[PDB]
Design a protein around this ligand. Structure first.
Ligand SMILES: O=C(O)CCc1ccc(Cl)cc1
Length: 290
């Protein structure tokens, strides 16, 4: 975990540069140093207490630019630093961290929907391609459990997907897993205990409030309680054994709603509001700044 839930970037009217941190302990939000470049459809992750913002797209009134950028935020300094860029731009990207390396998964570059996957090594400041997924996936949910990487749902250029697959690093190989019971593009995907959770998303017709989880031992998906708000392009993270979902789009409003899931009571509750409604944020947890 760490201490704060950091939300970076996102979309409302145009791509956003906001970096804001929420403190579950007191309900407070802090506005921190803006991203150097606005971006929506990015992912966040943490390695060695540093926050990384990965990929996305700058949707601006002066043009639209898919991002291959990797940028690093140090809470100690309140400063963003550029890292090596990825091989390709990846809007609507998913990311997972294994053994202190960042896996960038899928995403789009204009009409190109990637199946490619690449791995960042912070000691080297270097990206390297690994085996591609079996499926092109943008708006892909990514989680890590037991040092295996999961790519869940998304959009292949033609169809939104219920499919999911797993990457075995020591084999450099992807294999399909049991598909979800729901087609989901732009779901929030995370791990809690022995399960991969997929919350919300878009099925090609409707934004979803439903939530399902994959037990790696049983290889089956089970629905849990739905969120209070239907949402796609949400941010998701885990903080002290609870899932937090941030923002997204319900087909009417860019949501400021933050919901929290308690696995013991199988209930969602409203915990806070983001300072403004937005979709396509990057979210991760690390220590409080300065
Ligand atoms: O299925 C689609 O068209 C993609 C929907 C989508 C939009 C934004 C994000 Cl961040 C993810 C997915």
């Amino acid at each position: 975990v760490g201490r704060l839930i950091y939300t970076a970037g996102g979309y409302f009217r145009q791509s956003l540069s906001y970096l804001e941190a929420y403190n579950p302990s007191n309900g407070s939000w802090l506005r921190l140093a803006d991203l150097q470049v606005p971006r929506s459809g990015l992912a966040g992750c943490v390695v060695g207490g540093l926050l990384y913002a990965v990929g996305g797209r700058n949707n601006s009134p002066d043009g639209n630019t898919d991002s291959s950028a990797l940028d690093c935020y140090n809470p100690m300094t309140n400063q963003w630093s550029p890292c090596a860029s990825m091989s390709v731009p990846r809007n609507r990207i998913g990311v997972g961290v294994i053994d202190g390396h960042i896996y960038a998964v899928g995403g789009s570059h204009g009409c190109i929907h990637h199946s490619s996957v690449e791995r960042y090594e912070p000691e080297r400041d270097e990206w390297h391609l690994v085996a591609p997924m079996l499926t092109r996936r943008i708006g892909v949910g990514v989680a890590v459990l037991n040092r295996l990487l999961y790519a869940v749902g998304g959009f292949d250029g033609t169809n939104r997907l219920n499919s999911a697959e797993c990457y075995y690093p020591e084999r450099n190989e992807w294999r399909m897993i049991t598909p979800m019971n729901t087609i989901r593009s732009g779901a929030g995907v995370c791990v809690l205990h022995n399960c991969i959770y997929a919350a919300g998303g878009y099925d090609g017709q409707d934004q979803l409030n439903s939530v399902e989880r994959y037990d790696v031992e049983t290889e089956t998906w089970t629905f849990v309680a739905p969120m209070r708000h239907h949402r796609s392009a949400l941010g998701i993270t885990v903080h002290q054994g609870k899932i937090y979902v941030l923002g997204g789009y319900d087909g009417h409003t860019f949501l400021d709603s933050v919901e929290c899931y308690d696995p013991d009571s199988d209930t969602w509750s409203e915990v806070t509001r983001m300072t403004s409604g937005r979709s396509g944020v990057g979210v991760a947890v690390t220590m409080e700044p300065c």
